[model samples]
Target chain A: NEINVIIEIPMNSGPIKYEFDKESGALFVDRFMQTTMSYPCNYGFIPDTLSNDGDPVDVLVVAHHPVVPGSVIKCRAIGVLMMEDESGLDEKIIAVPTSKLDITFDHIKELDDLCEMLKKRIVHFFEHYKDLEKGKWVKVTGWGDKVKAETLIKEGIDRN
Target chain B: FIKKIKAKANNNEINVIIEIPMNSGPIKYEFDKESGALFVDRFMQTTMSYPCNYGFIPDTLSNDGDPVDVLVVAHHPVVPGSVIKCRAIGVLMMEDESGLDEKIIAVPTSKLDITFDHIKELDDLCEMLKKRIVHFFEHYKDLEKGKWVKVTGWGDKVKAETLIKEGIDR
Candidate 1:
């Protein structure tokens, strides 16, 4: 099933956490964490799915944009990045703009199918995000196909 | 016509006290010697990574009484509070709460291609690139519900040096 993704941080810029405030109907910067690296793609969350950390399921949108904070776009999950942080199982779902863009890959079932540079950057960013000061901590569990991606989403929904 | 600085400018390389680095959160923090920890005052945050290393010139004060702000262009991000020696290229002339607070723009001494000798104006950079940089500075404080930082004009290296000198004397 397709999911609606909310853009927190847009592409080609730094990381800014924007959260949807239900009462005010405004998307506010929940917690601002600066990065030493630029985002290679759009980063945000999927609604109605809660991960083990009690936050919405994190997703990375592989598309171009002037996409602003609080934008909701329909997308399909192609893969899952099984990552374990200090908290627990924190998976970042990989998705592409369902209709727009000129992309060749239909679904990413393995890391090999993804662009080498893009995958590398993402991995490096997450691995060192907290390490520069907090120390080496994040453990990347593994990469998985669409079935795995959907299963994680189902688990998130159940947890929610 | 040549001017002089009391402190020998290191090849026109200015010293910067980095307040924030690119690709990180937008928190206003200062090193507290008493506590020996970064004391943070949460007012606003940035949604984008800084296009450059942002900080201020040392041994100088600005119209706002704060150290003259500078944006250091480098290949990568450096830790906060780190002093980077860089060469001035231009200045982003902006007006904020404290008045005409111009942010001197520079590049790391190692990044010769972006040195003052190479770039003469803000437009020296691509149109889209300069646009993005300006936009970031303008709206960054807006997330904090702060006043709009108005861009008054852009100046070249000579003007940037002059500001540095004036700030130093202050």
Candidate 2:
């Protein structure tokens, strides 16, 4: 027989490791590792030890958390990991879940632009391409096309 | 739409051209001889003219209208000028390199405190805000990492109420 456990960690903050008591349906946080306390997300690790002069330095780490429970439990890193090398430059330790899906231009950009265009259209419709509060009305006898004027009125004409 | 306005930086006043809808009413302008500042003489209440003509709203009308121009057009993008009472031109949501998501919104140039030298400051703030917004999005999924799952940007669109009704009478 196999026992199953589940855990969850939120974003912007750190992560919390939990152990589930199958029989009791209770969850327990792991207090063993120093990092388990901070539950630091990607780019969130503070630091492990103090510097030579007692100053603190935050070092990045590659950490993973259980995502889903099953045969091959899936996991996602809270964020990408970065570590320093001998030359004093940061190195990539792990990649976060963000890369899972690409925000392609064709997919996101077009829809976003459409929304903006619609917003502008709404503004134009309500205001008749004019500021509505001003209360100025216009009347014309022979302005060429009565049909056009009627259309304009139907399109939220601002004329008072 | 006034794509842009170029104001001189000295004490000489310049006329700012405006085009407004016909029903928009009573537009007034002023000019500052000392600082070259300009302001709207009064808020137009009724629709007047499209490509409506209005001159510089005098400084006398603006009260503290120096160091900047007070423009009352189809839309006034600043405070004492907006209903939210909160001034914001646009907002951005982004994620950090580590994939954490953050969001920041920018206020229109007119909405900012005069203490800010120019609109550039407001624009810069928007750029900085994008970094945090990106981070927020990236980190949104950290809670359930390692799981093959999908994320949706449900809140990205503005609410329907925000969408002004089109083809309606004012």
Candidate 3:
């Protein structure tokens, strides 16, 4: 179940967000985050798939290091976070890089394989990352297992 | 002393000061305004060297707090610190961690070989060369630890001229 993700914002970097401009398919600086915390993992989107949030399905690629922006990395979905933003139905897929470069997450074939603290960090990050951004609100309703994650991907692809 | 610039050499022409000649080493030789010194800003740290004659326009400052950057394409390499006349053909628009960084692409106004035609617009340059130049800037500082650079797109000579005027300290 290999999936391709376009890394827009790298790990441990940014209150600033870099995203793809839909109209031109070009990269642009989207905005500056009002929160102090940086991105916990590589944040990107699945190409050709449109989510209800009016953008591609978001994913957090857990890797040892940051992948530069505009890079396409191969990964596998292990789980999904059912999130609702101001626009609603904002789900973020949880994935681990398939490269031999980082073996730390190699055994992580499913949601439970992820470490406890790491899982909590992922949830907490989404919960409060948008707290300070004016006129923005988001909530994580629940977690979905590997099957649920795959189903969303299929649906995303259908809407493409 | 840094020589005064005749930015607009003639209608549709500009004088550019070369800080890093074509096929230069990985070092980023940046021009300094305070002392007019060409200082090594950094190691590109990438496998590739600069692909063109890199420099800046005189008396113009871009939003990045640096002089307007330029890349001159010529048959022969111009040594660092030399001024050459060129016509703006295109402008590569990039937004790095700092802000908008525009690199104006130009060609020599000097006489050339029978096969070499003056590049009039962005599309006149070979696609491969343009990609290489963009690729060089995109990955140059990749190893700088947590930094990111994105090449958004390119604009024509008209946009370059507009940028040049916008950057002038008028």
Best DockQ among the predictions, by candidate number: 1
Model 3 lDDT tens row, B1-170: 24455567677777677788678777778767787766988877777788898888877778766778898876545556656667788898888897777799887663322123556888878889888988888887788887878999999988998988888754
> TM-scores of all models?
0.45, 0.16, 0.52
What is the CAPRI rating of model 3's predicted complex? incorrect
Q: What number of clashing residue pairs does each candidate have, in the order they appear?
A: 9, 53, 0
- Interface RMSD for all numbered candidates: 18.4, 25.2, 20.0
| Residues B17-133 of candidate 1: C-alpha lDDT, one tens digit per residue | 566766566666564433424466563556666777777665676766766788876555555654555678788888887577688887755332222345545566667766877
Candidate 2: list runs displaced more than 4 Å. A1-160, B1-84, B93-104, B108-112, B120-123, B144-170
Q: Write one digit per residue (lDDT tens) for candidate 2, span B9-109.
A: 12222212222221244543444345334456555333332221122211122222222222222122111111111122222323334342211122222
lDDT of 2 by residue, A1-160 (tens): 1111122222222222233223322222221111222323222211222332232222122123323211121122221122222223322111222223322222222112334553343223222311222342222111113233223222322221
Best by TM-score: 3
What is candidate 1's CAPRI-style docking category based on DockQ?
incorrect
What digit string (tens of lDDT, one per residue) describes model 3 on residues A114-159? 8888878877888898786556787889888889889989888888
* Chain B TM-score, all predictions listed: 0.78, 0.24, 0.90
Clashes of 2: 53
For candidate 2, give the lDDT of residue B49. Answer: 26
Model 3: fnat (fraction of native contacts): 0.00
